[PDB]
Amino acid sequence: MIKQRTLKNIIRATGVGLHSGEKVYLTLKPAPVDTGIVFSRTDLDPVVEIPARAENVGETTMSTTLVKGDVKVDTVEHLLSAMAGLGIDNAYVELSASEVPIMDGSAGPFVFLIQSAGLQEQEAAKKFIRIKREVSVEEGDKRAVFVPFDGFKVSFEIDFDHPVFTQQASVDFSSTSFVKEVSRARTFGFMRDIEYLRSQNLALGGSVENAIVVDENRVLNEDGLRYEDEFVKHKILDAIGDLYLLGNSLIGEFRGFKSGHALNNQLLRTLIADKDAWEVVTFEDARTAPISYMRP
Numbered sequence: 001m002i003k004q005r006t007l008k009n010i011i012r013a014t015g016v017g018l019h020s021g022e023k024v025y026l027t028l029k030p031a032p033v034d035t036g037i038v039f040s041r042t043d044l045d046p047v048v049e050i051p052a053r054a055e056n057v058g059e060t061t062m063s064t065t066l067v068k069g070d071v072k073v074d075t076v077e078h079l080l081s082a083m084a085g086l087g088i089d090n091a092y093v094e095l096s097a098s099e100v101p102i103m104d105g106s107a108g109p110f111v112f113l114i115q116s117a118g119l120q121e122q123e124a125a126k127k128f129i130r131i132k133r134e135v136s137v138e139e140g141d142k143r144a145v146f147v148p149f150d151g152f153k154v155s156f157e158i159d160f161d162h163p164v165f166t167q168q169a170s171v172d173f174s175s176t177s178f179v180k181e182v183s184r185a186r187t188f189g190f191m192r193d194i195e196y197l198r199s200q201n202l203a204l205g206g207s208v209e210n211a212i213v214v215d216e217n218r219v220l221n222e223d224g225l226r227y228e229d230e231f232v233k234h235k236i237l238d239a240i241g242d243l244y245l246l247g248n249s250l251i252g253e254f255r256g257f258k259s260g261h262a263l264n265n266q267l268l269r270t271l272i273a274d275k276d277a278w279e280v281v282t283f284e285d286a287r288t289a290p291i292s293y294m295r296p
């Protein structure tokens with residue numbers, strides 16, 4: 001059968017919060033069957049824990065935020081994308097501060113730290129959410145859709161009127177490596193936006209070392225892009241992180257059109273509410289299942 005996965009070993013990492021500019025110590029820990037992903041602010045006494053579930057998502061600010069009262073964890077989407085891409089079901093994420101470290105601006109450093117630890121299969125069937133019906137959310141010119149699909153696929157389109165800006169990509173993850181083709185795609189920022197955010201005490205940890213910095217015309221990063229389509233690949237990365245707040249891996253297709261965290265969360269809420277549009281399924285036989293995972 002397809003089995004739940006956690007970490008084999010604890011992972012420790014250091015970085016800076018994109019927005020906070022705060023040094024943050026990150027620990028990923030193995031967790032029991034049916035824990036899901038749980039974030040933990042260990043700088044607090046008592047320690048405050050927020051399950052990485054759509055119901056805990058906060059005011060859809062600059063990034064995906066988990067809240068519980070007046071406690072938050074900022075910018076969870078790149079880490080959850082790394083955990084989604086590798087099929088991790090159960091894990092404790094401990095943070096010394098309010099924001100997940102940005103690292104290089106991609107999921108690459110997290111996927112590497114996790115695959116360095118290795119994964120442990122657990123004695124329990126992995127539960128999948130299978131899309132049975134199309135679920136569509138729109139707001140203005142933005143659109144986010146689930147389509148039934150025997151597998152896992154993410155299609156994305158962006159549309160910037162900007163000299164730097166392939167603005168479309170589709171990845172079937174059963175035939176294309178999240179690790180190689182998506183995970184290294186970095187966050188990006190326009191200089192006019194970054195100058196505004198800085199003026200408002202935001203982007204305090206931003207640098208060419210953790211973001212593609214774009215002025216009116218070109219990428220300012222001396223070493224350029226990792227992919228010709230890095231921008232729309234990063235959109236796909238962020239969508240994979242947000243999808244993982246369902247708390248179960250998806251069997252279906254996601255289509256984004258200029259979508260972002262706020263509409264992505266409207267789509268998760270609408271899917272969860274419409275119980276006719278999905279079912280929980282397990283696979284007693286991995287060989288006939290529409291998705292596959294790497295060796296642990």
Ligand SMILES: COC[C@@H](O)c1ccc(C#Cc2ccc(C(=O)NC[C@H]3C[C@@H](NC(=O)[C@@H]4C[C@H](F)CN4)CN3C(=O)C3CC3)cc2)cc1
Nearest residue numbers: 062063077187188189194197203206207208211213234238
């Ligand atoms: C040494 O410093 C000195 C100096 O040079 C310097 C250099 C750099 C910085 C910085 C920085 C920085 C600040 C904010 C952002 C950001 O929010 N990007 C949003 C982008 C990326 C994507 N969204 C995402 O990736 C979401 C949102 C987060 F980005 C994570 N997930 C969607 N998206 C948009 O659609 C944009 C067009 C609206 C990125 C980088 C500061 C100072």
Ligand SMILES: [Zn+2]
Nearest residue numbers: 077187234238
């Ligand atoms: Zn991002």
